[PDB]
């Protein structure tokens, strides 16, 4: 079956700056600003646009050795990012792939909110473990706050 899971998180960074750093250069930043979560980001194919395949390696004492993502869509105008988890990590057994959508929306105070949508493709009637859904939420926020701290400490960056 297909199971959807959504999340919203708040950031002080405005939408235009956050999209450039967190989405367009998240692959560059994540090994640098969050070494405890991402050890290395490795492009397999493409630039980073649609059709791009990337191998994300996790540091030692890892829940998963690696994971492979496919970039599905990058909408600069609407601050919308689509990618799919297709190999490694939780992929296998009863879980076929994970379809993800991230949309950054400007907020009335000058900040932004991230609308994360996680779409899991499971085996027949099987269901996903709540820890799997929880772990993805943990990973996203830690990366966001690490990039958020980087931008605040580097006011010239992405601006």
């Amino acid at each position, epitope marked *: 079956g297909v199971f959807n899971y959504e999340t919203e998180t708040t950031s002080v960074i405005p939408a235009a700056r956050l999209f450039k750093a967190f989405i367009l250069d998240g692959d560059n930043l994540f090994p640098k600003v969050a070494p405890q979560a991402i050890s290395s980001v490795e492009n*397999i194919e493409g630039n980073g*646009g649609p059709g791009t395949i990337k191998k994300i390696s996790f540091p030692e004492g890892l829940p998963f050795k690696y994971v492979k993502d496919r970039v599905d869509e990058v909408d600069h105008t609407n601050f919308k990012y689509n990618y799919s988890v297709i190999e490694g990590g939780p992929i296998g057994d009863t879980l076929e792939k994970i379809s993800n959508e991230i949309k950054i929306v400007a907020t009335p105070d000058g900040g932004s909110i991230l609308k994360i949508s996680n779409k899991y493709h499971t085996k027949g009637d099987h269901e996903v473990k709540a820890e799997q859904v929880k772990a993805s939420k943990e990973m996203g926020e830690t990366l966001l706050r690490a990039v958020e701290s980087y931008l605040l400490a580097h006011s010239d960056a992405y601006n």
Partner: antibody
Amino acid sequence: QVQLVQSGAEVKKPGASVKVSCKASGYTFISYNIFWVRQATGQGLDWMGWMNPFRNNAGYAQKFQGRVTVTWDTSISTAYMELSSLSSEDTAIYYCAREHGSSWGFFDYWGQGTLVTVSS
Amino acid sequence: EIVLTQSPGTLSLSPGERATLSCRASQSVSSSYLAWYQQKPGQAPRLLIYGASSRATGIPDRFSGSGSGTDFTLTISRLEPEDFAVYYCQQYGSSPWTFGQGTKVEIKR
């Protein structure tokens, strides 16, 4: 099927500039990088510079020393390379090659070659 | 740069024989990031073994690659008349990316 079709033979006087085109087809143009590689029979292969149509930036080989300029037209999926200040040492065949990935930089598909002859 | 030295400059062999081509790197090439290309006179290079051991699509099984660190090899288990050409090795483990000078596989009589 991915193809890289280049413009044809150029004959130039020394001191002039040559602009070679490389039209890509069979894939999304902005999704892959394209390098330019010279092949003169003197040496083997030398990369000249690379374009990144998704990040809108470029990098250049040191040996050619800023005589290489890479531009592109996404609307027609065509990559351009202009080699300014042409001498008789620049007589060679120039190739355009698609980079497979920004980290897996192996050129899966290659252009057919463009001959540039710069003699007086 | 990582300078790639290929040996021998010319390899002379008969059809059906094993061909072993060497690509020595001045520095260690990370993750076995080295590729092999085939080029015939008047033609563009064609991708072959990549990742130092992985075949490109359309490449027959007689082409195989091996090695790690500073030494990589390209093996043609059984040469055929279509296999006599110049082969190049290309590393992409460290920027900037460099090629070898070329090893020519020659017919022999």
